[PDB]
Design a protein around this ligand. Structure first.
Ligand SMILES: O[C@@H]1[C@@H](O)[C@H](O[C@@H]2CO[C@@H](O[C@@H]3CO[C@@H](O)[C@H](O)[C@H]3O)[C@H](O)[C@H]2O)OC[C@H]1O
Length: 511
């Protein structure tokens, strides 16, 4: 050993550590860790395989030998056998491996180090450490140690006096060293691509109408990285017709059950929102959760629905239909969601209504009407403009339409965030300079709002992915600021030229 890449001392957060086993419970407790410091208790284990795990792919590379060390303690009777296991996904064979790397006998009531050296295959990713015993005993652990032998020309700094500049992390991108360096260098906001959606956070087993179980396990390594590096997080998303398990809307908590009543759904909705915010605060209190998309994409693209049905999607599940409309009949669930979120959200977490095609007249007018109403009721802080646009200065998402919409939302009096900006080349139909021109147009439009008007502000501009190898549109649409090799594109240098150097600030402390 020689160089330390991880040291988890649960002094503030849960440090990326997660319950292994659906009913296992983790709780970090002052004074009860190692050397009288804060430690992680693991309780309610009901078999030997239950315990705790942490995905360390942000820190650990395949092919490198690491010394893993953990201090453990139990308060059972006699000796307990602790085990450290390392698991990983082999990125070539697509196959997972798991191995006990250390076994250690631990007497009751004594802090004991368990450690071993382990080198994963060079193709290993998602390197994950876990701690169990050969029993169901409660334990405490601490000091997870893993060892090995004004103002810069970066987006966050350039825009420091204007807005946060954000990107997106997901379960795969966590492991990419190059992406990690990129995020640390350029971006002061992160949204989880999928890991905070209801289907990633809802826990079916043991959920009841008034106590919906949630888990941050899918998002833990991202929240932990952001909290540790002073990167603010936008929560995404509390309510959406998509990526939400069908069972959440059914009487027996099964996909195949009967649709619940509105009053049962109100309980489940409030419980989910309440427990999401409670868990974020419990596990990652030092995280700057600066925004949350409370309701996502509830307005129909169909002009007939915006005209005659208050913008409600068609009721149902899948094909763009809404299980929320299925239960509530109506977009009435939107105000309910904001009401609950307002009750449970931290004071500094700004509440957003988030939507795409938000510059399309019929849809834009409907979005603006919903948000104006929520805003004036004190329930909403801003409109999220998803900005899934193409590289054309003209047309459907052209600069004229885009600015009209930006201005119209700003004119409500609320703030705006550009939340999921990507700029499709449409399979090579558009040039990279055309793309650069759209990016610059969008960033300039937001800068103009902030220098003008003033009342409402653009408080974040976020792109939906880090580079072209990691976009939900497919790489053939080459939609982002960095290419597949993580090199800056013409769009990056165009966006990097909008703010004069005299105006750059501390991106880690934006205005
Ligand atoms: O098969 C599943 C995929 O379809 C899923 O892809 C994600 C779908 O959501 C994408 O983000 C949304 C883009 O549209 C906006 O309206 C929403 O606000 C966004 O959440 C995300 O980028 C894709 O990765 O991934 C999970 C798979 O199981």
């Amino acid at each position: 050993a020689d160089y330390e890449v991880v040291h988890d001392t649960f002094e503030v957060n849960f440090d990326g550590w997660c319950n292994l086993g659906v009913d296992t419970y983790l709780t970090a407790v002052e004074n009860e860790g190692n050397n009288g410091t804060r430690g992680m208790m693991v309780i309610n284990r009901s078999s030997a395989s239950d315990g705790a795990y942490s995905e360390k792919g942000f820190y650990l590379d395949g092919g490198v030998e690491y010394k893993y060390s953990v201090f453990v303690k139990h308060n059972g009777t006699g000796t307990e056998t602790f085990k450290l296991s390392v698991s990983y996904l082999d990125s070539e064979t697509e196959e997972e491996n798991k191995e006990v790397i250390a076994t250690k006998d631990v007497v009751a009531g004594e802090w004991t180090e368990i450690s071993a050296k382990y080198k994963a295959p060079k193709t290993a990713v998602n390197i994950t450490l876990s701690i169990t015993t050969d029993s169901t005993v409660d334990f405490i652990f601490d000091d997870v140690t893993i060892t090995r032998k004004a103002a810069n020309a970066v987006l966050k700094d350039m825009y420091a006096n204007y807005f946060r500049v954000g990107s997106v992390l997901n379960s795969g991108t966590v492991n990419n060293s190059s992406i990690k360096a990129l995020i640390l260098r350029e971006f002061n906001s992160i949204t989880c691509e999928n890991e905070m959606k209801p289907d990633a956070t809802l826990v079916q087993s043991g959920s009841t109408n008034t106590n919906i179980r949630v888990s941050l396990n899918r998002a833990a390594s991202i929240l932990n990285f952001c909290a540790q590096n002073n990167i603010a997080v936008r929560g995404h998303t509390l309510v959406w017709h998509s990526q939400t398990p069908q069972w959440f809307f059914k009487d027996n908590f099964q996909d195949n059950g009967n649709w619940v009543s509105q009053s049962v759904m109100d309980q489940r909705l409030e419980s989910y929102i309440k427990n999401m915010f409670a868990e974020i605060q419990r596990q990652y209190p030092s995280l700057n959760l600066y925004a949350y998309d409370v309701v996502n994409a509830a307005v129909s693209d169909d002009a007939n629905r915006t005209r005659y049905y208050g913008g409600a999607r068609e009721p149902g599940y899948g094909n763009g239909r809404s299980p929320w409309v299925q239960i509530y009949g109506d977009n009435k669930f939107i105000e309910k969601a904001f009401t609950y979120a307002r009750k449970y959200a931290p004071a500094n977490c700004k509440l957003y209504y988030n939507d795409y095609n938000e510059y399309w007249d019929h849809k834009r007018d409907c979005i603006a009407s919903i948000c104006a109403n929520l805003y004036n009721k004190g329930l909403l802080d801003g409109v999220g403009m998803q900005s899934h646009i193409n590289a054309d200065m003209n047309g459907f998402s052209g600069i004229q339409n885009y600015k009209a919409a930006l201005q119209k939302y700003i004119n409500i009096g609320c703030d705006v965030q550009i939340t999921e900006l990507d700029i499709s080349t449409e399979n090579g139909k558009f040039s990279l300079q055309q793309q650069a021109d759209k990016y610059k147009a969008v960033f300039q439009a937001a800068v103009d709002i902030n220098r003008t008007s003033s009342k409402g502000k653009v408080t974040a501009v976020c792109v939906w992915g880090p580079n072209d190898a990691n976009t939900w549109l497919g790489s053939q649409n080459a939609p982002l600021l960095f290419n597949a090799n993580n090199q800056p594109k013409p769009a990056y240098n165009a966006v990097a030229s909008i703010i004069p150097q005299s105006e750059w600030g501390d991106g880690n402390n934006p205005a």
